[PDB]
Coordinates of C-alpha atoms and ligand atoms in Angstrom, one line a residue:
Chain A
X1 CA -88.6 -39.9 -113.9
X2 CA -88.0 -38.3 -110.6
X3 CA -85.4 -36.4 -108.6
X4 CA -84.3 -37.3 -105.2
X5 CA -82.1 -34.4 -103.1
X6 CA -81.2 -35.1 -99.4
X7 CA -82.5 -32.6 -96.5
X8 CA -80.5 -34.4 -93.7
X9 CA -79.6 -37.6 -92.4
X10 CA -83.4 -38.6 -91.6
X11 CA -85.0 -37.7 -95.0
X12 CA -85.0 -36.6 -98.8
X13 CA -87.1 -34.9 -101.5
X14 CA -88.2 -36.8 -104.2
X15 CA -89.5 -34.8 -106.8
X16 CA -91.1 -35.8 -109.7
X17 CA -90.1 -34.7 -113.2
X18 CA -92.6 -34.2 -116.9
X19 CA -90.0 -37.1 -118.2
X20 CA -91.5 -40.2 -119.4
X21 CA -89.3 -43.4 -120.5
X22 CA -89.9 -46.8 -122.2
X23 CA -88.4 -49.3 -123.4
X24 CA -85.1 -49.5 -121.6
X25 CA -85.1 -45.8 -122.0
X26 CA -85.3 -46.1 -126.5
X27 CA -88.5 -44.2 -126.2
X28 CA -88.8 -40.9 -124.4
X29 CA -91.3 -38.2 -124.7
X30 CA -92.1 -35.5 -121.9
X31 CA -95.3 -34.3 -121.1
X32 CA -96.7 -31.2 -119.1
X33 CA -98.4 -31.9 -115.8
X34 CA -97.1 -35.8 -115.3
X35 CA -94.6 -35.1 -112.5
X36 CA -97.6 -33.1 -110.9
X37 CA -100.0 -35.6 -111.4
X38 CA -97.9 -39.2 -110.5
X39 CA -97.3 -36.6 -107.1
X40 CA -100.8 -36.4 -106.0
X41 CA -101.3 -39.7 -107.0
X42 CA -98.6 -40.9 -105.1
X43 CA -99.6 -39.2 -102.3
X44 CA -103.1 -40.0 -102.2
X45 CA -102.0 -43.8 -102.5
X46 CA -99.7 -43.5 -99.5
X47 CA -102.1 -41.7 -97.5
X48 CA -105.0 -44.6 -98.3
X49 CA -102.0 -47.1 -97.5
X50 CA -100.9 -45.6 -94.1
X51 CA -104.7 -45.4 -93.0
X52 CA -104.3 -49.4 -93.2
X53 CA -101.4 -49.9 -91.3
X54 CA -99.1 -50.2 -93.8
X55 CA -95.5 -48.5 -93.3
X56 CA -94.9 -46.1 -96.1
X57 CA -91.8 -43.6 -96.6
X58 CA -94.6 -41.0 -97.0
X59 CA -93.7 -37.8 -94.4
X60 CA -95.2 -34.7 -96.4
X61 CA -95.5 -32.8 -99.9
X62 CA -93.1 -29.7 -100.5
X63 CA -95.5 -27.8 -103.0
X64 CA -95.8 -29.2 -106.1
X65 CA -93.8 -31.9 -107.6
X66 CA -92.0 -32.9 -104.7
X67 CA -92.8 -35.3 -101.6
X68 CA -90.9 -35.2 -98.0
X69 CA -89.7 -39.1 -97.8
X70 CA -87.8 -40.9 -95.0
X71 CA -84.4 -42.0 -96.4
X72 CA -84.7 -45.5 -96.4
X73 CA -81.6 -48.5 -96.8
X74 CA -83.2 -49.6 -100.5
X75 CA -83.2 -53.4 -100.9
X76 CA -82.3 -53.7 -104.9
X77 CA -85.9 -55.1 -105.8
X78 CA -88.5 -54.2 -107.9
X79 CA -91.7 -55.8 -106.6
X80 CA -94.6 -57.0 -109.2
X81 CA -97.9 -58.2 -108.3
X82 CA -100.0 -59.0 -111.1
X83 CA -104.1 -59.5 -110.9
X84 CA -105.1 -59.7 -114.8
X85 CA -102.5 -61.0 -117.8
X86 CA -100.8 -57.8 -118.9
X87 CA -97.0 -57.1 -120.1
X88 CA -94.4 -59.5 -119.7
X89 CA -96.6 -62.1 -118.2
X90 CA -97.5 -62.6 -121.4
X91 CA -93.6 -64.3 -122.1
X92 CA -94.3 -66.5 -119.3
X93 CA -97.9 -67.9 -119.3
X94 CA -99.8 -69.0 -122.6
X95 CA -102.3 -66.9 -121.4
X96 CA -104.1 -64.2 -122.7
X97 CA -104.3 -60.1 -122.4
X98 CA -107.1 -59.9 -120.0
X99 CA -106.7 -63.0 -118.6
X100 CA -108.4 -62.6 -114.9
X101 CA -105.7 -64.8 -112.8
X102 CA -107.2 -67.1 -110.4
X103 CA -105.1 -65.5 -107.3
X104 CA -102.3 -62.7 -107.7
X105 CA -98.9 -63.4 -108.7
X106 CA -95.6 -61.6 -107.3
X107 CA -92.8 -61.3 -109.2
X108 CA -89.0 -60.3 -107.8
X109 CA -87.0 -58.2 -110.0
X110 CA -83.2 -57.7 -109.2
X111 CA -83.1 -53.8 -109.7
X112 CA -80.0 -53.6 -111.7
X113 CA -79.3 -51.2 -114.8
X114 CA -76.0 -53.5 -115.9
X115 CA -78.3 -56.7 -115.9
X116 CA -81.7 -55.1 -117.0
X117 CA -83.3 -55.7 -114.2
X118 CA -83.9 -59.9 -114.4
X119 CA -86.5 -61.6 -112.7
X120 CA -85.3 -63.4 -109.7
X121 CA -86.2 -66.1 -107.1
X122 CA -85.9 -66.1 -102.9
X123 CA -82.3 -67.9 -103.6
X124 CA -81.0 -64.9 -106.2
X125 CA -82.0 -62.8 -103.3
X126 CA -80.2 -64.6 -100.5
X127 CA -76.9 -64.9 -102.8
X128 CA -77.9 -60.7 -102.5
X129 CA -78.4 -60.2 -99.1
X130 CA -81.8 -60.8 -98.8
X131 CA -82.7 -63.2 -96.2
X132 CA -86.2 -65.6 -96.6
X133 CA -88.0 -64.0 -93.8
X134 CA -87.2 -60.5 -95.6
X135 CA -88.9 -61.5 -98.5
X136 CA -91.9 -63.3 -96.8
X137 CA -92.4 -59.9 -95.1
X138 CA -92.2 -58.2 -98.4
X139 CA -94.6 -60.2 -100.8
X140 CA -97.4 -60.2 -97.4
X141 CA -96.6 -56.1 -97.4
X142 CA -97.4 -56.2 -101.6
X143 CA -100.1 -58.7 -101.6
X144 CA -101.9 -56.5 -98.7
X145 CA -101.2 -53.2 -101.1
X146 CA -102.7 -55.0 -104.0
X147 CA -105.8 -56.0 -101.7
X148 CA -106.3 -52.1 -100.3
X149 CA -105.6 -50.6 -103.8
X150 CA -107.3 -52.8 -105.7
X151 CA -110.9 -52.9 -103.6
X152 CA -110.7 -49.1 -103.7
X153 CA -110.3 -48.5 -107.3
X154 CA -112.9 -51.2 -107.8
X155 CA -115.4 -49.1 -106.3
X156 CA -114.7 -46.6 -108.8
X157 CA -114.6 -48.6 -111.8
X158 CA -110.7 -49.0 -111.8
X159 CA -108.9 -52.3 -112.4
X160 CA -105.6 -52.9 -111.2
X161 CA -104.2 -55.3 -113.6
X162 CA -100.8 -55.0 -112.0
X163 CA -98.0 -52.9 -110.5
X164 CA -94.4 -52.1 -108.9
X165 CA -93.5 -51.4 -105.8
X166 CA -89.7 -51.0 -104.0
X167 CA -88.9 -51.1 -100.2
X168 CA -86.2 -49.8 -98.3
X169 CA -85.5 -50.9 -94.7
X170 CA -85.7 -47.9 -91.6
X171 CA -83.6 -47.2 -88.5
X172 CA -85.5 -50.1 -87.0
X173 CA -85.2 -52.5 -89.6
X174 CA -88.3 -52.6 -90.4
X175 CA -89.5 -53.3 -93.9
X176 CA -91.1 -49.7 -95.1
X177 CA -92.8 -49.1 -98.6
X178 CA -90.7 -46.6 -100.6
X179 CA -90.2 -45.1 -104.1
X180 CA -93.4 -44.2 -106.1
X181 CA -97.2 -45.1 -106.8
X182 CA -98.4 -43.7 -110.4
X183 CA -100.0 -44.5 -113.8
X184 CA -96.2 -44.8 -114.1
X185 CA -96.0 -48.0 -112.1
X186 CA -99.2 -49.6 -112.3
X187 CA -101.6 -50.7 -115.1
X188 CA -105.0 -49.4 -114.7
X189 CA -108.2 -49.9 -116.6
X190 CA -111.3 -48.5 -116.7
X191 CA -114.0 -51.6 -115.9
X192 CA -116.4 -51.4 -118.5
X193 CA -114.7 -50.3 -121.6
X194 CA -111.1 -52.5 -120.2
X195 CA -108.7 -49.2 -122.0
X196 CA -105.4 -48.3 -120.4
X197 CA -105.3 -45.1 -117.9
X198 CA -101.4 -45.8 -117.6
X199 CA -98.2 -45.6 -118.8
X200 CA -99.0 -47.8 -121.2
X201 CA -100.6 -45.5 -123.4
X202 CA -97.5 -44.2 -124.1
X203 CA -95.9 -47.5 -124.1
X204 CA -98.1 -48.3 -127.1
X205 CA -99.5 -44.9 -128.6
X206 CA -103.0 -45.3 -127.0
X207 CA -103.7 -42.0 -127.0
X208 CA -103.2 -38.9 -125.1
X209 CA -100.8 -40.2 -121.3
X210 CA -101.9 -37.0 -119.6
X211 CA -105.8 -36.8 -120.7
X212 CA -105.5 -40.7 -119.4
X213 CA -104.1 -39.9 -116.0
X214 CA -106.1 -36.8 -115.6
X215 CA -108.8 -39.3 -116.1
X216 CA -107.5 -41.4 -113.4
X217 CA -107.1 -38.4 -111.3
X218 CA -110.3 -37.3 -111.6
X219 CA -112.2 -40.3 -111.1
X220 CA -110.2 -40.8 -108.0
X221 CA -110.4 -37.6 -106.0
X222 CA -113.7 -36.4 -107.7
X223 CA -112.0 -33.4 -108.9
X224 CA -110.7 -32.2 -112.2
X225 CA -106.4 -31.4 -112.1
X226 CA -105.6 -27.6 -110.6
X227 CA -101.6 -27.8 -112.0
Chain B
X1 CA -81.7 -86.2 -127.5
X2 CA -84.2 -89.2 -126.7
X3 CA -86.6 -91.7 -127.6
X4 CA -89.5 -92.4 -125.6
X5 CA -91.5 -95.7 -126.2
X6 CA -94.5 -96.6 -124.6
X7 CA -94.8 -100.8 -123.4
X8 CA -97.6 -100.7 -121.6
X9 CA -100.0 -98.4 -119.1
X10 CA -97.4 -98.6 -116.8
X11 CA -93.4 -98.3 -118.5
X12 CA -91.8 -96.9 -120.9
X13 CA -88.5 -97.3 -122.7
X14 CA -85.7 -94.2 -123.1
X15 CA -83.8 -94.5 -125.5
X16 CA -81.4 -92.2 -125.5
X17 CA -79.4 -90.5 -129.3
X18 CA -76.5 -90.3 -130.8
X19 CA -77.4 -86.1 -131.4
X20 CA -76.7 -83.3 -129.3
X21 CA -78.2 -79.8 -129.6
X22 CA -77.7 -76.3 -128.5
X23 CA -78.5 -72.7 -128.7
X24 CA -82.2 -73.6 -128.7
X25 CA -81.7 -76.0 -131.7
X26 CA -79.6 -73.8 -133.1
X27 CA -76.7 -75.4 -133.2
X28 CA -76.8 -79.5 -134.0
X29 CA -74.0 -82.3 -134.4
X30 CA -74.3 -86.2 -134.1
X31 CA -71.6 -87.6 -131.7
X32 CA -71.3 -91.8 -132.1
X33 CA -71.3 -93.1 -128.4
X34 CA -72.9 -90.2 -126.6
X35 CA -76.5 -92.1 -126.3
X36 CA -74.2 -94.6 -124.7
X37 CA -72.7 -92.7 -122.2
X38 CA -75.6 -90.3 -121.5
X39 CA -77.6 -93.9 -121.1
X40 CA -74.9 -95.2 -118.7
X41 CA -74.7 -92.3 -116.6
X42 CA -77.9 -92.0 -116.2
X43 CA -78.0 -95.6 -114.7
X44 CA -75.5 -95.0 -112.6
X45 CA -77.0 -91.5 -111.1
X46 CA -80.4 -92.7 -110.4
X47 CA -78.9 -95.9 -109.0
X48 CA -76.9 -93.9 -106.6
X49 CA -79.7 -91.7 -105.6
X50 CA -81.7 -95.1 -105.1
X51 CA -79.4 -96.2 -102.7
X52 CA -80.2 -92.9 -100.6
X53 CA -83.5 -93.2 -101.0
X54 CA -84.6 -90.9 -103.8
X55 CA -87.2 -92.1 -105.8
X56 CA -86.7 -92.3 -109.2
X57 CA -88.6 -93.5 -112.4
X58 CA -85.3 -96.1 -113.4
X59 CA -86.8 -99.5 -113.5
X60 CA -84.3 -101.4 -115.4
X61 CA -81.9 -101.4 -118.4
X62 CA -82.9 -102.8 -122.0
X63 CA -79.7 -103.2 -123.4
X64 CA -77.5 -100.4 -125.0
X65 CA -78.6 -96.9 -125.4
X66 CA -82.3 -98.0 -123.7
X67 CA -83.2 -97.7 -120.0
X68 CA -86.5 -99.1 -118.5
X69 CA -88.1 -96.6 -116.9
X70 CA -92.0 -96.1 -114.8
X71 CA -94.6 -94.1 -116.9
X72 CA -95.4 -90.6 -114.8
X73 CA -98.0 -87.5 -115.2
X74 CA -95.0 -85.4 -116.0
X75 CA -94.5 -81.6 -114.4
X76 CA -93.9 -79.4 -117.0
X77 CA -90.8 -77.8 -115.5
X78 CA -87.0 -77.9 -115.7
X79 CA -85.4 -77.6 -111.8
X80 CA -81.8 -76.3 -112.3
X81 CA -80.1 -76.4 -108.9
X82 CA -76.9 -74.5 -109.0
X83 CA -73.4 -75.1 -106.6
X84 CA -71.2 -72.6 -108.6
X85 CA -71.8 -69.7 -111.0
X86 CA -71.7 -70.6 -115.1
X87 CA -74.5 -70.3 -117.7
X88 CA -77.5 -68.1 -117.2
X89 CA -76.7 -67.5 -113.7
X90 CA -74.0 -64.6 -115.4
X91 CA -77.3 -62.8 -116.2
X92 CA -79.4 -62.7 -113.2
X93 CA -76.6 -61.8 -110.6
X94 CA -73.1 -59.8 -111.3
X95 CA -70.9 -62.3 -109.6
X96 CA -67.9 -64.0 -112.5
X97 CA -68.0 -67.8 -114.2
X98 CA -66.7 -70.0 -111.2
X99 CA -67.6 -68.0 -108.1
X100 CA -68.7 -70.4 -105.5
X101 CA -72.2 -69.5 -104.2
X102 CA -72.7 -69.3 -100.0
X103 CA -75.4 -71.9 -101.3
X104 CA -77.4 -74.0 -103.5
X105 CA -79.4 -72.2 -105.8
X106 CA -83.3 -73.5 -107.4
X107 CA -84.3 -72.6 -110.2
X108 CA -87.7 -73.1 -111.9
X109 CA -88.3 -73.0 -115.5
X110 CA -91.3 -73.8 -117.5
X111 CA -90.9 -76.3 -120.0
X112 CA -92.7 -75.1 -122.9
X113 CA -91.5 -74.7 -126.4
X114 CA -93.7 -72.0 -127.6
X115 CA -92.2 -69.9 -124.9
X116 CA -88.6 -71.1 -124.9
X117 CA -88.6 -72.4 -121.0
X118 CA -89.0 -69.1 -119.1
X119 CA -87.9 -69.4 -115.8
X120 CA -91.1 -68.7 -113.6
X121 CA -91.9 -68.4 -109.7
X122 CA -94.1 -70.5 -106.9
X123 CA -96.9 -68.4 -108.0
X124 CA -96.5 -69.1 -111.8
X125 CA -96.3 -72.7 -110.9
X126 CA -99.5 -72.1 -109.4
X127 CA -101.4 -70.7 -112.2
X128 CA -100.0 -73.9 -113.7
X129 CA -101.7 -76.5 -111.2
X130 CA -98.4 -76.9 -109.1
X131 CA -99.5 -76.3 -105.5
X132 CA -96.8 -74.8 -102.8
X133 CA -96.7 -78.2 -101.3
X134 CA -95.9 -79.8 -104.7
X135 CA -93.2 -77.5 -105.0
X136 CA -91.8 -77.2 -101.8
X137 CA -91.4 -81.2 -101.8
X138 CA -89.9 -80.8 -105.7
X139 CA -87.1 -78.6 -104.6
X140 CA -86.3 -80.6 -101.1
X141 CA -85.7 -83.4 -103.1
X142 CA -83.7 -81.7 -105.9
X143 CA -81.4 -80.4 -102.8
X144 CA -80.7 -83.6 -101.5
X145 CA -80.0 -85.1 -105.2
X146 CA -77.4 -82.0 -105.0
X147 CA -76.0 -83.0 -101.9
X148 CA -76.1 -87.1 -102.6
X149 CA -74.2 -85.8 -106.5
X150 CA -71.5 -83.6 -105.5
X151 CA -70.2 -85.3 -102.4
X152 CA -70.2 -88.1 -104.3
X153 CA -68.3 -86.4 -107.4
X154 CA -66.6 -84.4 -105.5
X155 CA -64.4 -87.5 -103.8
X156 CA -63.4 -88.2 -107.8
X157 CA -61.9 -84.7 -108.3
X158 CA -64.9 -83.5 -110.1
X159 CA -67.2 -80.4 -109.1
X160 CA -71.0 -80.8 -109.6
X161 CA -71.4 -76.5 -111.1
X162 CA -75.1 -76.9 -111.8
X163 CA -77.7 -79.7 -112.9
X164 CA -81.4 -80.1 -114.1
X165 CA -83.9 -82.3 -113.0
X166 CA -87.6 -83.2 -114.2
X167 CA -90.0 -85.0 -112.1
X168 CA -93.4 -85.8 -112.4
X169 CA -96.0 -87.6 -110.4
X170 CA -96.7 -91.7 -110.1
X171 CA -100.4 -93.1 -109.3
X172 CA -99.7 -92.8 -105.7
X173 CA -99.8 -88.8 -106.3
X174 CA -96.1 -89.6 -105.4
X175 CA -93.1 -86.8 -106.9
X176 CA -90.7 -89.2 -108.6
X177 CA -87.7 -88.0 -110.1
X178 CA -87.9 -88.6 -114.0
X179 CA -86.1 -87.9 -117.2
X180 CA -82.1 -88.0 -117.1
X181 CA -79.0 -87.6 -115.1
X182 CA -76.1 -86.9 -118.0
X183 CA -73.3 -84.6 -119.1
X184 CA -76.2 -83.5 -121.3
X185 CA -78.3 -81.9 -118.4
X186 CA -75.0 -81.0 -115.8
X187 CA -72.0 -78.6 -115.4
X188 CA -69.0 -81.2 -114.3
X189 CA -65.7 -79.8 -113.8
X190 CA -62.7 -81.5 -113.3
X191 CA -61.2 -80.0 -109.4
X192 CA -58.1 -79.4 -110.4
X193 CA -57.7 -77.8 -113.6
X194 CA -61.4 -76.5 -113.6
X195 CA -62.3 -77.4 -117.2
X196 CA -65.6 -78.4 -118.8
X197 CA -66.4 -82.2 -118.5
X198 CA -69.6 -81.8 -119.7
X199 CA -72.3 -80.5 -123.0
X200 CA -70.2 -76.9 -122.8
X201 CA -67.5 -78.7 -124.7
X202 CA -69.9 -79.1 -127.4
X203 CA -71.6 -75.8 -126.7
X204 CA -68.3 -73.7 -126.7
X205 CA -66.4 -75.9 -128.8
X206 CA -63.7 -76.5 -125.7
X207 CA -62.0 -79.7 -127.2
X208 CA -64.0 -83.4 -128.0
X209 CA -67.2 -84.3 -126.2
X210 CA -66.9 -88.0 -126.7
X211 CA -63.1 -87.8 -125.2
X212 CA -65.1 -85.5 -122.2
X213 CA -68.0 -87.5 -121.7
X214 CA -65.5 -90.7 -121.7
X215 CA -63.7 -88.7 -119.5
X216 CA -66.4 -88.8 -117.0
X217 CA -67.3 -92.1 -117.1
X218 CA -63.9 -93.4 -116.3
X219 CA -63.1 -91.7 -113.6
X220 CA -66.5 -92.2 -112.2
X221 CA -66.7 -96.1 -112.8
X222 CA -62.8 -96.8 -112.6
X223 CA -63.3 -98.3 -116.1
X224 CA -63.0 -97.5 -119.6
X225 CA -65.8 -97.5 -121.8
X226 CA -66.8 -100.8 -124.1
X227 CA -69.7 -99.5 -125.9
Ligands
ADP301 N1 -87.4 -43.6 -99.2 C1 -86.4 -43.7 -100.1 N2 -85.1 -43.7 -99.6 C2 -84.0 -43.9 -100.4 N3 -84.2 -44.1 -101.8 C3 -85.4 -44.2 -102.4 C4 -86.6 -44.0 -101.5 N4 -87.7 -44.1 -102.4 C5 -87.2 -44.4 -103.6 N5 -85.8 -44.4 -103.6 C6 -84.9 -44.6 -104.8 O1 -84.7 -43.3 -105.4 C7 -84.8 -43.4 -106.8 C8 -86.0 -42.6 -107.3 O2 -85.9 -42.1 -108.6 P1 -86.2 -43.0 -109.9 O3 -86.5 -42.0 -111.1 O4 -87.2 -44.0 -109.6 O5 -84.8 -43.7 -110.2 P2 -84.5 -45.1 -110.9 O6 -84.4 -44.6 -112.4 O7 -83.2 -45.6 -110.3 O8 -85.7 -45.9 -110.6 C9 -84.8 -44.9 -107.1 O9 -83.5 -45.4 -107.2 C10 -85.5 -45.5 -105.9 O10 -85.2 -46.9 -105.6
ADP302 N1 -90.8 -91.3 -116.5 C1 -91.2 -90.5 -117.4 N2 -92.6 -90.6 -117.8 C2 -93.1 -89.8 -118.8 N3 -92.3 -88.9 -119.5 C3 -91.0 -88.7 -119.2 C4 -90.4 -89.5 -118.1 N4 -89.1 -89.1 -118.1 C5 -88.9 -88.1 -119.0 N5 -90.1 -87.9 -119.7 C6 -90.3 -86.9 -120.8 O1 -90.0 -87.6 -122.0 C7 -89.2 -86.7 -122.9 C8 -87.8 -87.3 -123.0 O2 -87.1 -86.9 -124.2 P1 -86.3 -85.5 -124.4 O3 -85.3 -85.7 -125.5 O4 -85.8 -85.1 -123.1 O5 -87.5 -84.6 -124.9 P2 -87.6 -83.0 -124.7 O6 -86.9 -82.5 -126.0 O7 -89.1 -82.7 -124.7 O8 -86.9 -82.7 -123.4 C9 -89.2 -85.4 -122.2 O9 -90.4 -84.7 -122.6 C10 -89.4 -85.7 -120.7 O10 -90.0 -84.7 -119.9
CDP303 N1 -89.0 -51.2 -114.3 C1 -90.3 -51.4 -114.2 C2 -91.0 -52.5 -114.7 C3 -92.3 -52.6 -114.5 N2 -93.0 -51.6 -113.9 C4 -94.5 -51.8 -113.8 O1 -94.8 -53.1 -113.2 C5 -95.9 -53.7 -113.9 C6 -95.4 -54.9 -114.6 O2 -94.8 -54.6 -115.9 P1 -94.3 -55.7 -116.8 O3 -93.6 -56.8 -116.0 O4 -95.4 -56.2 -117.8 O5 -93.1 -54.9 -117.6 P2 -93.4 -53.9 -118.9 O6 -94.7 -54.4 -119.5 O7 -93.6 -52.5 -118.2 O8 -92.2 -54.0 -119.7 C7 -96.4 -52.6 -114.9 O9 -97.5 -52.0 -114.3 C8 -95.3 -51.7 -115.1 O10 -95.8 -50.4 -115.3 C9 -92.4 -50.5 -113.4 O11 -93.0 -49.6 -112.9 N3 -91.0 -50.4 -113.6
CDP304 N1 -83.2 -76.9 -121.3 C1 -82.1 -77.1 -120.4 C2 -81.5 -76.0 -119.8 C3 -80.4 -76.2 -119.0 N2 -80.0 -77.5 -118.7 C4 -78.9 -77.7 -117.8 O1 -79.1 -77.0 -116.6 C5 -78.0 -76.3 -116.1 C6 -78.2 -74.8 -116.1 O2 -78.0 -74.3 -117.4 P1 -78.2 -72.7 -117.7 O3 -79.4 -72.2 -117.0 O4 -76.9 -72.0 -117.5 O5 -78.6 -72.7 -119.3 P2 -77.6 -72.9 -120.5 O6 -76.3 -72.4 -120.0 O7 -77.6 -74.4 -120.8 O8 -78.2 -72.2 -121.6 C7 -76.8 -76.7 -117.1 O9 -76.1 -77.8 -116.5 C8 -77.5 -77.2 -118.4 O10 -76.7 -78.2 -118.9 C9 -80.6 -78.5 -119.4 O11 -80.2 -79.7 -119.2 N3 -81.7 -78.3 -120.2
MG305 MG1 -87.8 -45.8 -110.6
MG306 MG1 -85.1 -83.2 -122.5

């Protein structure tokens, strides 16, 4: 779903393409304005994140599609945290679609196309590199995301249900929040009426992905999408 | 594989079958003496552990295929601790059948049938009623069954691969090691020749399982068995 072209030794472009992929990548479709719209997004969700101390990758835009990141050492994980009973929590828990959880859950996920990305466990992640404290320092980063994201969609009548996030280590080996933050990667609903304003509306045929995440975008910034 | 009989509010009897399963009860096959030797085993495993002060639910033997064994408020989970790389494990990381891990690996899985055991996390556990501290105390104990097992084996020429363990909870509130210790629920392979003692000679159809499983037991006890 996104391009990522070097600039130096320090940082990269990551551009975002109209692509859209499900399934293990059986289901594509592409539609007009997505790259542009998981951008600003992404950007607006960095910039929210950054104002609360968390370290991001996020250095600037480059007009349009494309972000100015800080090329980061990726650890191989895929980071879940999970507020309502969505997705493949649904294989784990006899729990129900809209089941509000009683605290958030984080799930590992070894980011590896060969595998299919399996769910792992702090040992998996040792046997890969990954020392405890590492992770520790991870799942307090994600659970303070979900916190900050989740209170300020709230307020505009936006559930997170749950999302992915990936980290990269910098220079300083630090622990520094990379890749992407979109209707792509998250599941959103609107409070009242609990209907998708995500990816999952293509997932599922829902409706229309890009009137969804204008809808998202719009409810967010107060304005309707310039393209 | 096993009977369980109430006595009173306190025991129960395990009795343990002639049958063996596979594949999620896909596969099926009765073998005459396996209850026997799984029954035996097990004796021997939790008396061992006993010794080094693992509490376990073994109470006494009731002749035959039958142990005696305290009643508990079982944890619905399945702890696989894992020494070297066979089974699942081939799935989650990209490492060959045999490597020997820099160390122990727990896994938790949820026992439930409707579900097919899915292997969850602390915070699934949670959602479940299984606080940290319950867990943290379940897999320090299932390490040091680990230790007690393959030092143990590994002075008879036989490598401990991987095990499960269940445990559940006594009136004390106390975590007490429950269920079985068997070919059944282990990966034993012989050190030199590095072949299956063990339920993969039944899953994989590697040779006899009663000659395997006898196997076992005589070079465990010193003795052949009288059935
Ligand atoms: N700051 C960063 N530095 C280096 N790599 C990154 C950074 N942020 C994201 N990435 C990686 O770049 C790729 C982004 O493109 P994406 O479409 O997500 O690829 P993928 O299909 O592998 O997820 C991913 O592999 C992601 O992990
Ligand atoms: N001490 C104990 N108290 C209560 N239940 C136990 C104890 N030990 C084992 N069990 C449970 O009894 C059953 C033993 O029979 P088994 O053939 O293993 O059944 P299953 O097919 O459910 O694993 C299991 O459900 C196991 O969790
Ligand atoms: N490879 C993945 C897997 C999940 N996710 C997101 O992570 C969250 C959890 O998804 P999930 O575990 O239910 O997996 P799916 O339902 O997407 O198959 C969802 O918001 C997904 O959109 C992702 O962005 N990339
Ligand atoms: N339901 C289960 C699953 C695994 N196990 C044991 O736990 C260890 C790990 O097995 P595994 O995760 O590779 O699963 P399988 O290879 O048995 O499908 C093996 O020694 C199995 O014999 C068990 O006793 N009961
Ligand atoms: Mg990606
Ligand atoms: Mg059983």
């Amino acid at each position: 779903a996104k391009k990522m072209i070097p600039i130096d030794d320090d940082k990269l472009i990551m551009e975002f393409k109209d692509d859209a992929t499900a399934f293990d990548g059986t289901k594509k479709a592409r539609f007009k304005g997505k790259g542009w719209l998981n951008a600003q997004l992404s950007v607006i969700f960095f910039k929210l994140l950054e104002e609360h101390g968390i370290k991001t990758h996020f250095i600037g835009v480059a007009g349009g599609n494309r972000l100015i990141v800080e090329k980061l050492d990726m650890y191989p994980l895929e980071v879940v945290v999970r507020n309502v009973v969505a997705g493949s929590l649904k294989k784990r828990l006899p729990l129900p679609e809209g089941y509000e959880l009683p605290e958030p859950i984080v799930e590992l996920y070894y980011k590896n196309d060969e595998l299919h990305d399996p769910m792992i466990n702090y040992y998996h992640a040792k046997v890969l590199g990954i020392s405890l404290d590492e992770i520790k320092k991870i799942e307090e980063i994600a659970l303070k995301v979900n916190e900050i994201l989740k209170d300020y969609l709230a307020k505009k009548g936006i559930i997170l249900v749950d999302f992915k996030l990936e980290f990269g280590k910098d220079k300083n080996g630090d622990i520094v929040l990379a890749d992407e933050i979109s209707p792509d990667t998250c599941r959103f609903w609107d409070a009242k009426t609990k209907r998708s304003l995500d990816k999952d509306v293509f997932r599922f045929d829902k409706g229309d992905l890009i009137e969804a995440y204008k809808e998202i975008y719009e409810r967010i910034t107060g304005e309707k999408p310039e393209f």
